[PDB]
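Researcher: Can you fold this with chloride ion in place?
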Amino acid sequence: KVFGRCELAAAMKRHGLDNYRGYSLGNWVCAAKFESNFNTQATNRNTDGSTDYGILQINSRWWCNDGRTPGSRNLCNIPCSALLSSDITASVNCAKKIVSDGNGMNAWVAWRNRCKGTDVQAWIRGCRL
Ligand SMILES: [Cl-]
Ligand SMILES: [Cl-]
Ligand SMILES: [Cl-]
Ligand SMILES: [Cl-]
Ligand SMILES: [Cl-]
Ligand SMILES: [Cl-]
Ligand SMILES: [Cl-]
Ligand code: NA
């Protein structure tokens, strides 16, 4: 499922992303654009062996089982495929967790590089929310 900035923002809002960790709803939508491009079946194979899943490219070293990332964990207790689902309750429910973890949204690299310290609110400019 390919989301639309608005639809995603609102999607994120009802799922407790709105201001979670004090990261305003905009942030996630920006985080989204560049991790996945508002996209759910988005994946990545990083040559370390792990794979990134979901609208937020959640990496299978720490956060999801996928069965093929020798020596990893599954904090968030799900198969990485849950993250590809159109119902994002997971990408969120784990996203919540990752962000809660310690580094703040920095875990998301693209957010670090492409969203940090910028016009964020713009990513919801004039959405109906
Ligand atoms: Cl967009
Ligand atoms: Cl914002
Ligand atoms: Cl594994
Ligand atoms: Cl594999
Ligand atoms: Cl554990
Ligand atoms: Cl699992
Ligand atoms: Cl933080
Ligand atoms: Na795993």
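Model: Folded with chloride ion in place. Strands lie at 43-45, 51-53, 58-59.
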